[PDB]
Amino acid sequence: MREIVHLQAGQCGNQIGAKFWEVISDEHGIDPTGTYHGDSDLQLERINVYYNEATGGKYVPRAVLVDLEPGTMDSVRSGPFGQIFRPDNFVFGQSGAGNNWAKGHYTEGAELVDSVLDVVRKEAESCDCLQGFQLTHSLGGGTGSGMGTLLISKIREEYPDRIMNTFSVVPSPKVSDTVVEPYNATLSVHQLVENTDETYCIDNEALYDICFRTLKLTTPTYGDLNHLVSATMSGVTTCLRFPGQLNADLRKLAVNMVPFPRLHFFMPGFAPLTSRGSQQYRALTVPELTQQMFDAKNMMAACDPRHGRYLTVAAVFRGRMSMKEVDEQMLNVQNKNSSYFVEWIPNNVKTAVCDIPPRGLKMSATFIGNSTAIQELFKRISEQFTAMFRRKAFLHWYTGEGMDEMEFTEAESNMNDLVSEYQQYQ
């Protein structure tokens, strides 16, 4: 009865969001054609959260896909599950923004978003109690970044009392894929702080590290990294759609991990990843998972807890399991790993357990973290942006489009004052 509209913008967001809808179909048993073939009534019980209803048994995804370059959406609709989405939600512009944030904010995408407002309005008014918008994008690509951060700012003015969950891949030091991505970082996170509630900072180097170290897979292309990514967004709503022993919706999590509006940047994780030679040698238990969640290796960020302190941590379980060992093992690591948590927040861990497991795995776990290792990630962004603006370089694509340099210095003030305030509580 609660619904989420899944906005999906940018080529990275389109490719990540393509796998997102692929797994929740796989957990519910939906073919690429669109004929329902779920073998259980449990997903029939709660399906209206993400799918909508068409006449004849067609369950249509509630996905809006918008991008300024038409090349992705052809490959999206030519994908394995691209034959099911809404063509009227597909609104493609012609000119790609060219990794420029000001292109997505004044020049070409600024006209397109008015059409985007009508499309999301069409999906919104069909419901009665909507949670909010799960938008998948990326900070690196200015087409997803320039248009996307204008969308959060516009929806927030329109809809004050909802939830705004954003899954964005933050810029990375070693997999720097765009020269102006530090500019695309600072001009975008400046909108991510003020008017966004749930923000999930995914860093691809750990995703690169996980497939290298933990999985040791020989040929995992983008069809395989996105599979690990796509599981985590389900764990955000794994208690929303699957009823069980202990239930928690979105804002139950959102209020709980966020003490102040400046602290809302979430490191995600998934937890039953296992090396292919070691299924039979590994015993499937809750204490086996206890090392695995609070392993530093399995996080989706190139960050170290060694560097920062946990404030709030959320780890939702998934499977048929007791409540003893869930509390007892968390009693163990809250004891031993006391230095990682701050001394002034007790009962750091929120544990919620869902009974329904994913297909092909008897048990699952999903990680959310709110540490103070994200301050150095944003600090490294700040100093590189400080060095670039010191030379005032690359600005002719920016200043030549009418936007002024006063927006650069305010974000530079706003970037440091985000993480300077992180220090006071550290």
Partner: protein, 160 residues
């Protein structure tokens, strides 16, 4: 004997799948009754359910549930025929096989059928729907399964 036991195990797995999709069967029956406007006359035949699926079923999942129910009934009838095809049969076994044929008859009225413990198929439906609407169609699986198991036990109890 051995193939009959394998067929019975396959029928048990199929009935478990049908019980997992049991609410889909009830929704399919409700949709078929609403489409055919037979809200007063209850469905009293497997042939009647097949005709409703043939003429008044538009949902794909509803059609799949009805097809699974009809195929499970066809497998039950094939096992009933295979029991006589395999074993000679005692007098009580002949009575049980005649009961199996009467229960699996498509033209037979199933409105008088109600399950008992430990089969919670009746409790899986509402009291009015079990009393007058779909109790026999819901509970046909358990009594027929018990009859097949009793026939298998009787065939095992026969001397060599």
């Amino acid at each position: 004997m051995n193939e009959v036991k394998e067929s019975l195990r396959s029928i048990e797995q199929k009935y478990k799948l049908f019980q997992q999709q049991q609410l889909t069967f009830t929704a399919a029956l409700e949709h078929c009754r609403e489409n055919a406007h037979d809200k007063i006359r209850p469905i009293s035949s497997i042939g009647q359910v097949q005709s409703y699926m043939e003429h008044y079923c538009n949902s794909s999942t509803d059609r799949r549930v009805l097809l699974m129910f009809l195929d499970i009934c066809s497998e039950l009838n094939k096992l009933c025929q295979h029991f006589e095809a395999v074993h000679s049969g005692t007098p009580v076994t002949n009575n049980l096989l005649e009961k199996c044929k009467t229960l699996v008859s498509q033209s037979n009225d199933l409105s008088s059928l109600r399950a008992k413990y430990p089969h919670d198929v009746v409790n899986h439906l509402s009291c009015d729907e079990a009393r007058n609407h779909y109790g026999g169609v819901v509970s046909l699986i358990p009594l027929i399964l018990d009859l097949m198991k009793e026939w298998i036990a009787h065939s095992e109890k026969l001397p060599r």
